[PDB]
């Protein structure tokens, strides 16, 4: 699936 | 962000856009701190 919930995609 | 980057439909009041490892880009929701595969600016899968 994927879709990094607001928590991972914040680099 | 005219001129300086930003060559697409501006993200709504509380949204962003970042590419995931899955292979496709998603839409981050600032309103509730989340993400989705479908863009809110229109309502179609990235």
Swiss-Prot record, chain A:
It is found in: Cytoplasmic vesicle membrane; Cell membrane. Residues 1-11 are annotated as: Interaction with Nedd4. Changing residue 6 to A: No effect on interaction with Nedd4. Controls axon guidance across the CNS midline by preventing the delivery of Robo to the growth cone. This is Protein commissureless 1. Interacts (probably via PY-motifs) with Nedd4 (via WW2 domain). Interacts with Robo. Changing residue 4 to A: Abolishes interaction with Nedd4, ubiquitination and internalization. The cytoplasmic domain is required for function in axon guidance. Belongs to the commissureless family. It comes from Drosophila melanogaster (Fruit fly). Ubiquitinated by Nedd4; which promotes endocytosis of the comm/robo complex and comm proteasomal degradation. Not ubiquitinated by Nedd4. Signal peptide: none annotated. A motif (PY-motif 2) lies at residues 3-6.
From Swiss-Prot, chain B:
Ubiquitously expressed. Residues 9-42 form the WW domain. It is found in: Cytoplasm. Interacts (via WW2 domain) with comm (via PY-motifs). Interacts with N. Essential E3 ubiquitin-protein ligase which accepts ubiquitin from an E2 ubiquitin-conjugating enzyme in the form of a thioester and then directly transfers the ubiquitin to targeted substrates. Down-regulates Notch signaling pathway by promoting N/Notch ubiquitination, endocytosis and degradation. During development suppresses activation of the Notch signaling pathway in imaginal disk cells. This is E3 ubiquitin-protein ligase Nedd-4. The lineage of its organism: Eukaryota, Metazoa, Ecdysozoa, Arthropoda, Hexapoda. The gene is Nedd4. The chain holds residues 526 to 566 of 1007 of the full protein.
